[model samples]
Target: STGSATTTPIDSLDDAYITPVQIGTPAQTLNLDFDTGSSDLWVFSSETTASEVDGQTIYTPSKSTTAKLLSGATWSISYGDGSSSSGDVYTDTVSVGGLTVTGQAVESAKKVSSSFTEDSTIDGLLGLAFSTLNTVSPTQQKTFFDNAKASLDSPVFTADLGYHAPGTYNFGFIDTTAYTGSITYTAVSTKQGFWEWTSTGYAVGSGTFKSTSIDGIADTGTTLLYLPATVVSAYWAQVSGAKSSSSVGGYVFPCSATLPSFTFGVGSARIVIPGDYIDFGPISTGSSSCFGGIQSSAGIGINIFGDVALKAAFVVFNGATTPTLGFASK
Candidate 1:
């Protein structure tokens, strides 16, 4: 039963990636976003209002003989990106890649906010965060990883995110061939239901690397890197003509700008994000202005190492013992 799964990119636009997951007895396939920032296995379902479903393929638990309702169990979630979904709970055979959990909690959406309902591509989200973050009331549910960990060879998972390219998420065992150089391990602090770690330091291109440690979570759900206001201000300061756009929000800079490379310290190792990766994308169609991938955490109290930073390296989300994070060049 121990196995691994590879991630498939729904699009190259860098918004989010999805992987095929099987639910129910005969396996109703759904393309679910593997979100490390959250902890709920929610899907668009028959319970959702017809008008809100749009193009999403709904999960019909009634068709699955193995499906069992959880009585009064209910779930609701809101993301930092503003997307949200809430629903009833059911236990069904949920499988990803070759790994399968016979009685995994599948939150079937009865209500979805526009952010989720409007996104017709993704059918749901497969949260990989700690199970304590599960949003169900009356009783919380364990994630597929947690429920299947005992059957796995080892309690571990690895994320290999690529820029405009297909990546992978491996479970149970680490594949040395997937990355280059030695993996540097950093102890994780999971008090916040995230894979949070302290980065030793960071620096802009050719600038002195600061030794101050920054605490942040490695979130696959978020599209951009979010750092403390001071760190964000420092990094953007080096980019000429970069300014916070009131209309579009976040910082925008000329697409042709010679953006400086950014480096983040993890233990004794430093992973560098290339200058071109900092330019997220053009602010608008046929516009020379581009939005920066790095932004201030703002209202959030902690930093978030979103896709922009995670894609720059191979990451290991180890659940063994102390649950440390490992990083290496791809």
Candidate 2:
């Protein structure tokens, strides 16, 4: 079986991409952030404190006849941004687009951080990383993809994130028309429970490509692309008034700056990110200084090829025994 779903950015800055997901027997639909960086499928729910619930939709287990409490099972997870959530566990029917999985572990949130409460765009997150990273305790559970892989015609999924438009997520099969040119394949290292791979090198604007290997993870959950300090500095240097600002906690420049395009290599193929994409909106509402879409990963141990990079190309996450990733120009 195969399935396809549409995903759209929640805001103009492409802060996060969300996809509609149905849970429970009667199919309670909620827009969820499909995070390839995490491994727990958690949702806002009746279990969450009423005070913590903002405008986001909540999943009600009692409303579903197929829902079963996973006795003694609980889960908690934290992200690099300091946002966190913890909850009890339940097994129920979960569906994404045309794909459905029975006995899928659904983490019901009892508590959520203030950031989550304030941001009502996403009801919760559907983690697509390896189940090895699952936060459930007493017994870790497989992810929806892990559980549904057996029934899928092909054990793979593709992410087509758009700039300011709707994109598509396809499971079990790849859409040839979704991309232009042939895909460049690379071996993935899941030891860290992420779609980790190495890029051949990068170039700023039309500059010469530097032949260096950059190790990073392709993370749809993250909004900005994070690279080494040296690489980030190099990119920002090309802009006229760009400067790393401590006040904003990142690089910022005049909105009028003529930004340079960024290019990164996958095998021999090069994926270019338009200059406009690098202007990640203003640092504040109506501000003339805009924040950068790319930043230094020095604070974080691992580099991340986040939405900024992912949106530039079509990416395939192959779930075979020996996992691999494919990238193609779009």
TM-scores vs. true structure, each candidate = 0.97, 0.99
lDDT of 2 by residue, 221-278 (tens): 9999999999999999999999999989999999989899999999999999998888
**Candidate 2 least-lDDT 10 residues:** 275-284
TM-score of model 2 (CA atoms): 0.99
lDDT of each: 0.89, 0.95
Model 1 weakest 10-residue run by lDDT: 1-10
Residues 1-330 of candidate 1: C-alpha lDDT, one tens digit per residue = 566666766665677888889999898999899988899999999999888888988899999989999999999999887778898999999988788899899999999999887888899999999999999999999998899888888898888987888788887888899889999999899899999999999999989989888999999988889998889899999998998887988899988898999999999899999887787778888899999999989867779999889989999999986899999987
Runs of candidate 1 exceeding 4 Å displacement:
none
Number of the top TM-score candidate:
2
